[PDB]
Design a binder for this molecule. Structure first.
Ligand SMILES: [Zn+2]
Length: 92
């Protein structure tokens, strides 16, 4: 089931990044697209579906690749990217 139903829509997730720190090299649009919303502390984000949390984002980090690497069984990630994409990331 969905861990945080209130954050299931892209527009609700985007609102959470209003005060996302400027020096973070990963943008709200990319994080929100991958299911992540900002919890309001440093650069901590969580997936609305699996509740997986990620922080300390680096330049070049791809939110979809990170979602597949750390949280492969997420239903949202599998529905958006497909099991084939997840399997490829998991295999590397
Ligand atoms: Zn997830």
């Amino acid at each position: 089931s969905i861990s945080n139903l209130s954050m299931q829509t892209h527009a609700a997730r985007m609102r959470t990044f209003m005060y996302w720190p400027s020096s973070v090299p990963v943008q709200p649009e990319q994080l929100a697209s991958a299911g992540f919303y900002y919890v309001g502390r440093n650069d901590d984000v969580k997936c609305f579906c699996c509740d997986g949390g990620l922080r300390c984002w680096e330049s070049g980090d791809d939110p979809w690749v990170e979602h597949a690497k750390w949280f492969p069984r997420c239903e949202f990630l599998i529905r958006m990217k497909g099991q084939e994409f997840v399997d490829e990331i998991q295999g590397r």
